[PDB]
Design a protein around this ligand. Structure first.
Ligand SMILES: Nc1ncnc2c1ncn2[C@@H]1O[C@H](COP(=O)(O)OP(=O)(O)O)[C@@H](O)[C@H]1O
Ligand SMILES: [Mg+2]
Lengths: 50, 191, 535
């Protein structure tokens, strides 16, 4: 019964390894987590993230 | 080898009917359907047929957008004429545009005054002929001394259109290939 | 297996590199690019000559302009081309410093690559050192927003003279710095200020000397009047001092539609009727303009001939063929708006100008109009001169760099004091924290410290002073005293305190030197395989 917001931040932290972001991941992980949450859960689209 | 190709290549849809009684139907009608489809494409491409007397704001569209056409790279040739009524060669070139416009309906024929075209253009350099195609200038032609000058004829203008890739060499509309009916009549009698 | 062994096309031209030796060429390749622009840093710099393939020549010292339009082969130098450019587009200053600072991080990082530390772990040390360096600079940063507009007016000169001092424009730094400051006074809103950079135009004419350059308020045109018999200088009369400048999109021509059309002309009755149609059109045309009361009319396209004379009769000059992009800028300064058509022309949409004159330039057959405004208007246009084509381009670029430096002061009033003072201040901050946080990344903090020291040592090298006495004095003095505005005096003054020398730099400009450098070098260090397909 954990929170849903912290789930996306926890799993996205693994993706930001092996890149130029891993030290700046504290600020940019909030961007993609808040970005995808604005999308509709039923209809998640890949072209709206240009 | 060429004797077999001349039966189909050197005959239009009107001339292919000569071989209806001699040659096989399946050999002839297979090519007539091909040539009939090519005739239909030229009719759809016949978007022009008279000189478009334009003005500048429009140049930025008529001359160039057209040159893109469909943009299937459906390019369109656009012959521009920077006219100058004081010059004698300009009025000659204006007559060639209207004559060629009635024949070649797929090619766009554009005319505009030279004083309105370019800021402070040299009057000595007029008349000027520009040829656009897909937005690019294919030929920036100078006054008609290359094309005979004052003695320019319709045959010389049609030959220039073949050089820039606007009209095919073996086109039946060109005066070089469009032999008179009396000429072909004498050939059949003397054959 | 056969003798052919192919996986990808064109294996002969494609060649890989790997190992420690492959990375060694990358940092040493940056030294060749850095060493070229190392002498051009500071006020004692020297320009570089550029030659294009088309034969056009230009001279400059800006690092982005040097590296731009240059034929390159290695990929790492092309990243430095995009670097300097980065700082230029956003900031417009520090293009040589970010490349030298980026090369300094790479030079200090090679020693460490030689010991057995992984390259990504080295970049992690610079990130903690860079955030601690900028955080410490923010702590000792002074703000000038509390002062009034009078004292704040002076601070723009202290920073405008800094960037103009490192160019060839510095023969009169007091004179030309007012040009860069007075242009921004006319666009600032005086509260939650925005620069509105697009209004500020910039054009320079090749002619005369640079001392004759004077700032104007208007628009510079590179074209003549419709007829040369018109008067050159046009003044207003008894009332309505604004000249009522009418701006037009459609020129003086016959009306006709865009689509193809043929007007069927009947027998002689219709032929004589159409002669009265256009003759009454021009009479309706000139009555419409005189009803509006305009004194100057400009169209983007040329008027007809008959039309050029009809305007000349009523004392109504006209300019013709004004560029479409240039037409919009005239309406903003004159506090007007462009009419779509002539039927909507009225008094409210006309312009306002103090005076205009047709300026001659020697024996050349060209004409330039110079619009001037007595009161503070919206836009402003620079008027640069010089005795060469490239020196005007250099003055335009030197003024453009100063125009972007003062642009940062408007959006961000928090400034710093560079010239070796910020570098030595940020170098000892990470050094004092290195021995507290030994760990394994202490060598990365020391490499970041020594990398920052290359900038004031470069200024000491170009100025001729001893780097030993200069570096030892700054390290010993700044460790003793807390005042952090002492740096390398390059002009040879007796005092190194920069309060009296009138030098100021922005915080956003000096910050981007460290950020774009430390973020690039992470990418440079992470390359292992290097494949270059030969052209
Ligand atoms: N008169 C001066 N006194 C002290 N320091 C100066 C003086 N002029 C320039 N500097 C310093 O030298 C540096 C030179 O920067 P500059 O070369 O103009 O930018 P870029 O390196 O992008 O071309 C500035 O950051 C400034 O700190
Ligand atoms: Mg500078």
């Amino acid at each position: 019964k954990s929170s849903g917001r912290e789930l996306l931040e926890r799993c996205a932290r693994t993706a930001m390894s092996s890149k130029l972001i891993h030290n700046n991941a504290d600020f940019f992980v909030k961007m993609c987590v808040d970005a995808v949450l604005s999308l509709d859960r039923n209809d998640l689209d890949d072209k709206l993230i240009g | 080898a060429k004797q077999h190709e001349n039966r189909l290549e050197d005959k239009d849809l009107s001339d292919l009917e000569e071989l209806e009684d001699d040659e096989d139907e399946d050999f002839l009608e297979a090519y007539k359907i091909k040539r009939l489809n090519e005739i239909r494409k030229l009719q759809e491409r016949s978007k022009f047929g008279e000189v478009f007397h334009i003005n500048k704001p429009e140049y930025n569209k008529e001359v160039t957008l057209a040159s893109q056409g469909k943009k299937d790279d459906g390019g369109v040739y656009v012959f521009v004429h920077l006219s100058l009524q004081s010059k004698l060669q300009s009025r000659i070139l204006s007559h060639l545009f209207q004559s060629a416009a009635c024949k070649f309906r797929e090619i766009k024929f554009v005319e505009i005054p030279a004083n309105r075209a370019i800021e402070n253009y040299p009057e000595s350099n007029c008349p000027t002929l520009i040829v656009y195609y897909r937005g690019e200038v294919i030929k920036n032609m100078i006054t008609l001394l290359e094309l005979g000058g004052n003695n320019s004829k319709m045959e010389d203008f049609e030959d220039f259109m073949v050089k820039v890739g606007a009209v095919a060499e073996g086109d039946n509309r060109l005066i070089m290939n469009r032999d008179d009916e009396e000429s072909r009549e004498e050939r059949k009698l003397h054959y | 297996m056969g003798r052919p062994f192919i996986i990808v096309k064109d294996q002969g031209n494609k060649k890989r590199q790997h190992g420690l030796e492959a990375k060694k060429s990358h940092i040493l390749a940056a030294r060749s690019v850095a060493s070229i622009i190392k002498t051009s840093l500071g006020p004692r710099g020297l320009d570089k000559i550029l030659i294009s393939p088309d034969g056009e020549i230009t001279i400059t010292n800006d690092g982005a302009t040097i590296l731009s339009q240059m034929e390159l082969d290695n990929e790492i130098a092309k990243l430095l081309v995009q670097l300097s450019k980065s700082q230029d587009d956003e900031i417009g200053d520090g293009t040589t410093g970010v490349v030298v600072l980026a090369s300094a991080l790479l030079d200090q990082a090679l020693e460490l690559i030689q010991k057995g530390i992984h390259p990504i772990k080295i970049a992690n040390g610079f990130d903690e050192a860079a955030k601690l360096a900028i955080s410490k600079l923010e702590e000792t940063c002074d703000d000038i927003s509390a002062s009034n507009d009078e004292l704040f007016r002076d601070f723009l000169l202290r920073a405008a003279k800094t960037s103009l001092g490192s160019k060839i424009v510095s023969k009169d730094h007091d004179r030309f710095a007012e040009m860069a400051v007075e242009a921004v006074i006319n666009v600032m809103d005086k509260d939650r200020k925005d620069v509105d950079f697009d209004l500020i135009k910039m054009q320079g004419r090749v002619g005369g000397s640079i001392s004759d350059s004077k700032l104007i308020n208007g628009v510079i045109l590179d074209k003549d009047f419709s007829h040369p018999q018109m008067p050159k200088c046009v003044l207003p009369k008894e009332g309505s001092d604004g000249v009522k400048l009418a701006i037009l999109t459609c020129p003086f021509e016959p009306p006709k539609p865009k689509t193809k059309h043929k007007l069927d002309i009947s027998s002689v009755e219709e032929y004589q009727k159409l002669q009265t149609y256009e003759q009454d059109k021009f009479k309706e045309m000139i009555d419409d303009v005189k009803k509006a009361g305009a004194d100057v009319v400009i169209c983007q396209w040329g008027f007809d001939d008959e039309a050029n004379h009809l305007l000349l009769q009523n004392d109504l000059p006209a300019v013709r063929w004004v560029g479409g992009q240039e037409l919009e800028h005239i309406a903003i300064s004159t506090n007007g708006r462009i009419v779509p058509r002539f039927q909507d022309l009225s008094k409210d949409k006309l312009g306002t100008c103090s005076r205009i004159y047709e300026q001659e330039f020697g024996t050349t057959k060209d004409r330039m109009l110079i619009i001037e405004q007595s009161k503070e208007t919206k836009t402003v246009t620079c008027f640069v001169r010089g005795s060469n084509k490239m020196i005007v381009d250099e003055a335009e670029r030197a003024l453009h760099d100063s125009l972007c430096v003062v642009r940062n002061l408007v959006k961000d009033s928090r400034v710093v004091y560079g010239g070796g003072a910020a570098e030595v201040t940020m170098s000892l901050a990470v050094s004092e924290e290195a021995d507290k946080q030994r760990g394994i990344d202490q060598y990365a903090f020391r490499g970041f410290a020594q990398a920052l020291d290359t900038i004031p040592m470069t200024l000491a090298e170009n100025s001729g002073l001893d780097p030993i006495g200069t570096l030892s004095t700054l390290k010993s003095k700044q460790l003793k005293e807390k005042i952090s505005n002492i740096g390398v005096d390059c002009l040879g003054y007796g005092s190194n305190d920069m309060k009296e020398l009138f030098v100021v730099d922005p915080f956003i400009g000096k910050k981007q030197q460290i950020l774009l450098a430390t973020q690039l070098c992470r990418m440079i260090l992470k390359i292992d395989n290097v494949i270059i397909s030969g052209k």
